[PDB]
Design a protein around this ligand. Structure first.
Ligand SMILES: Nc1ncnc2c1ncn2[C@@H]1O[C@H](COP(=O)(O)OP(=O)(O)O)[C@@H](O)[C@H]1O
Ligand SMILES: [Mg+2]
Ligand SMILES: [Mg+2]
Ligand SMILES: [Mg+2]
Length: 416
């Protein structure tokens, strides 16, 4: 359940040390942060702790994939501590490790109101439980070292807050290994729990799922699970061509196609019919002569077919009308996956037009939830993060939730 987890607002932090896992995995161009959003996002949790008289706030995170080896001049969090100070208006004590006796002494009983950022968790193989040595070979953490790693993290506070929903699908040390009596979701985690509880436990109706992206093979379980929650489903993006080729016998040219997933399209459509789910597929396309931002473009319908050698990189205007009709009917929407190659302007109109509709939907009271890595990048890209109900911070984690899985980091939180 996503509905019964302890959260920071219900957690007494007065005079307690708070060890908080956050997502500070920000984009970097050589030691400079290019987007400080993920850091801004954690500030509400940090400031709440400080305002309610926390003795300290100890922040732990990862950055990149150092794969269990210290890489302090490629993947240090040091830049984040500078950025954080600016955003908080408070000194951040940065430590060059996250475990060991020197860290623990820094964290044992600090000055009331202290904010500390530990070095990258993934410099230790014990965080992920595996990684790679400097020759690229597998290494596997030892049980005893995992234990000591997790014990050392657990020394750094009295209560644990997880505000790192984007890592909650990993059973890593900082997510599941912190042995403290109260383990609470932070304010970011709470929002993710509350909205996805709407998507999965008690949705407003009609409930529409908009599913796009590139690869049908990676969407099978997402589609199957959402078919037990929703009243309607839009299928777009690259995976729509697998459906269209099978069901209509469409000529799809060199559009994405999954020979294996094709063998279960009929099975998915059957389940939609058994559950009463109305499926909206695209009916027209913007085509491209190659998979390139400056491709020549054309137009196609299911009836016309896509020219041999050409690929469908976006839906067309009649698809955008059919899509907008389903959005008009919804009282709740979860959208995972753009409906065309939104990175490139000639193939982004369908995704932008659909976003405009989701924004208008929200205005009249629709609950609108964006999942995904790329669908969230879409919101950031057209500055629509505040014009929908919820943009998820966890790409892979939101997808596994929507697939029906239990997230180890969520499961590890205290109940009640
Ligand atoms: N018709 C299409 N053909 C090829 N790629 C597409 C098409 N429509 C969307 N995409 C691609 O899908 C990618 C997003 O897919 P995915 O990773 O599955 O979404 P998310 O990360 O939100 O779950 C984008 O890079 C986009 O360019
Ligand atoms: Mg993606
Ligand atoms: Mg992600
Ligand atoms: Mg529990």
């Amino acid at each position: 359940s996503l509905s019964n987890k302890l959260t920071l607002d219900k957690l007494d932090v007065k005079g307690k040390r708070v060890v908080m896992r956050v997502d500070f995995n920000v984009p970097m161009k050589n030691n400079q942060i290019t987007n400080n959003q993920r850091i801004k996002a954690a500030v509400p949790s940090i400031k709440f702790c400080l305002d309610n008289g926390a003795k300290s706030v100890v922040l732990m995170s990862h950055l990149g994939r150092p794969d269990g080896v210290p890489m302090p001049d490629k993947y240090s969090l040091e830049p984040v501590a500078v950025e954080l100070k600016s955003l908080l208006g408070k000194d951040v004590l940065f430590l060059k490790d996250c475990v060991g006796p020197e860290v623990e002494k820094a964290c044992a009983n600090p000055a009331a109101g202290s904010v500390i950022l530990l070095e990258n968790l993934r410099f230790h193989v014990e965080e992920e439980g595996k990684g790679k040595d400097a020759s690229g070979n597998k290494v596997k953490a030892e049980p005893a070292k995992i234990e000591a790693f997790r014990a050392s993290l657990s020394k750094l506070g009295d209560v644990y807050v997880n505000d790192a929903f984007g890592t909650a699908h990993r059973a890593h040390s900082s997510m599941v290994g912190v042995n403290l009596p109260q383990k609470a979701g932070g304010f970011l985690m709470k929002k993710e729990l509350n909205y996805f509880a709407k998507a999965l436990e008690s949705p407003e109706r009609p409930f529409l799922a908009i599913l796009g992206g590139a690869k049908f093979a990676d969407k099978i379980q997402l589609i199957n699970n959402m078919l037990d929650k929703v009243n309607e489903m839009i299928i777009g993006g690259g995976m729509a061509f697998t459906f269209l080729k099978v069901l209509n016998n469409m000529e799809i040219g060199t559009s994405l196609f999954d020979e294996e997933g094709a063998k279960i399209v009929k099975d998915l459509m059957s389940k939609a019919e058994k559950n009463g789910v109305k499926i909206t597929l695209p009916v027209d396309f913007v085509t491209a002569d190659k998979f390139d931002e400056n491709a020549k473009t054309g137009q196609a319908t299911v009836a016309s077919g896509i020219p041999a050698g050409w690929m469908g990189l976006d839906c067309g205007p009649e698809s955008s009308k059919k899509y907008a009709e389903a959005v008009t009917r919804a009282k709740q929407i979860v959208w995972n996956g753009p409906v065309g190659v939104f990175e490139w302007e000639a193939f982004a109109r369908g995704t932008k037009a659909l976003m405009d509709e989701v924004v208008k939907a929200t205005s009249r009271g629709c609950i609108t939830i964006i999942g995904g890595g790329d669908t969230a990048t879409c919101c950031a890209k057209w500055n629509t993060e505040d014009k929908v109900s919820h943009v998820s911070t966890g790409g892979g984690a939101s997808l596994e939730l929507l697939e029906g899985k239990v997230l180890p980091g969520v499961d590890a939180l205290s109940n009640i």
